Amino acid sequence: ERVMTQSPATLSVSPGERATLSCRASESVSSDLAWYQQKPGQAPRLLIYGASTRATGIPARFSGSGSGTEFTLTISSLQSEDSAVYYCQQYNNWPPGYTFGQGTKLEIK
Amino acid sequence: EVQLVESGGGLVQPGGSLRLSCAASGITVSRNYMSWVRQAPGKGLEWVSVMFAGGSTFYADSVKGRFTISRDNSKNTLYLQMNSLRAEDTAVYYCARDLGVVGATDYWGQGTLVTVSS
């Protein structure tokens, strides 16, 4: 049971610029991760699995990085609709297992 | 289109029972690793249960001994029976198909609110 901690809690960046979100683990997680964008009002949506592989369809504007116990997601140019909550999910024990984070709130201006 | 639709959400008195149901489309369930997730209002998420493609199921510790997963393979659907609902279990429950290392959880359900009488 590896506990994941996201940071920071909130982030407000001008439109059109980059955005950086950190998610911190307590054990080793190697490259077992994923990133979900839960736009407010419905179920989450998978963006990037494994270490940085972009899920099908998912706009190239997203970029994942990190390995070991520390990972980061990066957005090239935030549009008005990018405001949502994001979660880093680990799965080092897959059958049966997953462990979610606390979420991060991203807004614009 | 490929989707997962849910039912059973409502209100029940504590200690009471309930049954959640999950229907799918354009994808099979019998041979797909199924996983039920839930979300407390305002909080994070937590893995609740999983059923395999051979039948050997597993449950989380927080709900171990109280919940039982089953699936009507004949009509391509999943089910989750709940009992002894206590004050914590008021949450929205999601249905998901998780693959794991070859693609993490992707297809999710519209959800279903589950609150208690009080």
Add this chain to the structure above:
Amino acid sequence: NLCPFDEVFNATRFASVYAWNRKRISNCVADYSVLYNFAPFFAFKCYGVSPTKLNDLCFTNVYADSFVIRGNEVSQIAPGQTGNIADYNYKLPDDFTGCVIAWNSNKLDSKVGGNYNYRYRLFRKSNLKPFERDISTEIYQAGNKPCNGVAGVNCYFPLQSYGFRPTYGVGHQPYRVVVLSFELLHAPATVCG
């Protein structure tokens, strides 16, 4: 007249839990003086037979099944135990008499380049019958066609790599495991001592 257990355990070529390796011991004197008495054995446990009686037990044949699994999955090799490796890959019976041994091969089989040569089984259509070799090269599915003509959906390959590399913690260090099954069916015993 000693058995070839020495080689069996020291060949340091163990293949995979996918299509495990077997040997039918017969026509020897089972010493055991080194078995479960050698120094670097980590875990040894048998069901049905006591160790000293074992050193005095006698049988018709032996079946050894060596393979390599991830350390956190050793608990699934057990009578009727349920999980992934024990439900779709290799399943030992409920009344299985004999012992298993597991070594933390955290040095012998690992490479900075990724010692993922072995591909364990992560997609099976239905649970295994005990000792059912299911080595296969197919595409498990959801949509009409397999990945030969489709991509993304229904493009799964049951052989998934391990990715053994040295930074991995203990829970992810390749454990080599060997299981012994003594058969007693009506036949002259060629293994005793």
